[PDB]
Structure formats: C-alpha cells, structure tokens
Design a protein around this ligand. Structure first.
Ligand code: CA
Length: 279
C-alpha cells in the first residue's frame, strides 16, 4: 500500500534516502496488536482514530486529554492519516496532568497497571507501550520500566530533550527498554535530542504533524514525537510476525538504515528506524 503526500516522518521510515513524500507499508497495518500510550490521555472521539482508541485508566479527576500531547503521540502510533500502524488498537493511560506534569509514583503505578491490564485484552499479535515522558535519574522509575518490558510488553521511551547524555534521565537510562533519539528531515540529529551509549535507535522528531485535541491537527517537535514512530513500527512488525516483544528493539536496530545521520557524537549509534518494505 502507499500513502502519497504523507507527513515526512512516515515517508522517511519507509525509504533508504531522505526527501521522499510517499509512505509505503504492508496493508495488514498492525491489525491484531495493541499499543498503550502512557501520557496526558487520548481524545478517543477524534475521527482520525476511527473508533480504535479508548481510555482505560486515569489518575486524575477526569480521563480526558486537556493538554494535547497524548493525543498527538497516539496519532503518530496509529491514526489513519498520521500514523505508522493504521489498524492497531490504542489504549490510553493518563499519568500526566493537563499541564503535562506528573509525580514519579503515579508514572510507576501506570506502568504496573499496563503489565496487569494486558492480560484482560485481546491482542493476539502482541503488546507495545509508548512512553513520551521522563525526568532526572531514578532507579525506581527505571525498575518499573524494566518490569513492564520483562512482563512481555515492548517498551519504547523518549531519550529526552536536553541535548545531553541520556544516562542522567529516567526511564531513558534503563538499558533493557528501547530508548529513542530524534532526527530532522535532513537526516541531522535534532538539535535538542539527548544522545549517548544508552540510545538504541533514532526516529523522526522535528516538525511532526499529527492529531490534536478539539478534533484538529498540529505540528510540534521533540523526542516525544520520535518515540511513537518506533512504537508504531514495532506493532507493525509484530503483526507481520517478523519479531516478538522481547526482541523487537534489537530487530529494529539490526534492520535500520546505518551511518546516514549527521551530528551524531562518538559513542552514540548511527541507526535510523526503517520498515524494509518491498512491494
Ligand atoms: Ca536499550
């Protein structure tokens, strides 16, 4: 299948070269898999989700996304026009408030919740969790991420937006999950993207068009936008039976475009997510 005039990021992950505008993908499109978006919530009634999104847990007075961040990330995972895996099932978990802030105890609770809740859902092709959040180092936050990964969920987390070594941030610095850096449309490291040996992979993160609250759309930037590209890609490959939850991150690194990024510091991988599609 092919989406012409796609957002540049979707085109980029189905091509060996920058500058293309068509997104090539297999029709199965992540059907049968599930992705938990752990964020500010999801505006499930957005037409772009076609009824495939729902809220399953909130830690505040309401389950509604009063911010937009969560709705944006979810859209990149699996909305019709802006998403990698256009037929996946999306589940929203609201651990961040409408200012985009959250306590680390609440974030940990949300991760433990997904590990248990997945046993109540029908997800024959596998389960992914996408975490576009983070903060200063905490061994408790890392440990919760590692538990979630160990329970059989593919865990993707943002590297962080401090233009620094991601080893001082959590859950970015947990080695057993998949830590995602950001690139721009000219194959440069995004100027804000964290880096370092703990990074596994890069995704499109600068000027990413996606869904927003009020049934709208907007373009924003961050390692937060790169993380769902990778979460979406994992769900897509699991549906195709190419890989499993335990080994999806490594499979994505092995099959990535290599050496094509610029401004990567020594000791940071030069790998860009890539779906290897062939018609
Ligand atoms: Ca890792």
């Amino acid at each position: 299948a092919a989406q012409t005039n796609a957002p540049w990021g979707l085109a980029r992950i189905s091509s060996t070269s920058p500058g293309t505008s068509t997104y090539y993908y297999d029709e199965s499109a992540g059907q049968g898999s599930c992705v938990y978006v752990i964020d500010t919530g999801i505006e499930a009634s957005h037409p772009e989700f076609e009824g495939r999104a729902q809220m399953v847990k909130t830690y505040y007075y309401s389950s509604r996304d009063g911010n937009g961040h969560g709705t944006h990330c979810a859209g990149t995972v699996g909305s019709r026009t802006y998403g990698v895996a256009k037929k996946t099932q999306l589940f929203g978990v609201k651990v961040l408030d409408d200012n985009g802030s959250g306590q680390y105890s609440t974030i940990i609770a949300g991760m433990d919740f997904v590990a248990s809740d997945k046993n109540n859902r029908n997800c024959p092709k596998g389960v992914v969790a996408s975490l576009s959040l983070g903060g200063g180092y905490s061994s408790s936050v890392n440990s919760a991420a590692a538990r979630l990964q160990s329970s059989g969920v593919m865990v993707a987390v943002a590297a962080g937006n401090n233009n620094a070594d991601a080893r001082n941030y959590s859950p970015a610095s947990e080695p057993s999950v998949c830590t995602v850096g950001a690139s721009d449309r000219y194959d440069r490291r995004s100027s804000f993207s964290n880096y370092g040996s703990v990074l596994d992979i890069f995704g499109p993160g600068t000027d990413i068009l996606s869904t927003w609250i009020g049934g709208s759309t907007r373009s924003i930037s961050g390692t937060s936008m790169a993380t769902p590209h990778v979460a979406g890609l994992a769900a897509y490959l699991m549906t195709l039976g190419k890989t499993t939850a335990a080994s999806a991150c490594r499979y994505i690194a092995d099959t990535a475009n290599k050496g094509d990024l610029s401004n990567i510091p020594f000791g940071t991988v030069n790998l860009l997510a890539y779906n290897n599609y062939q018609a």
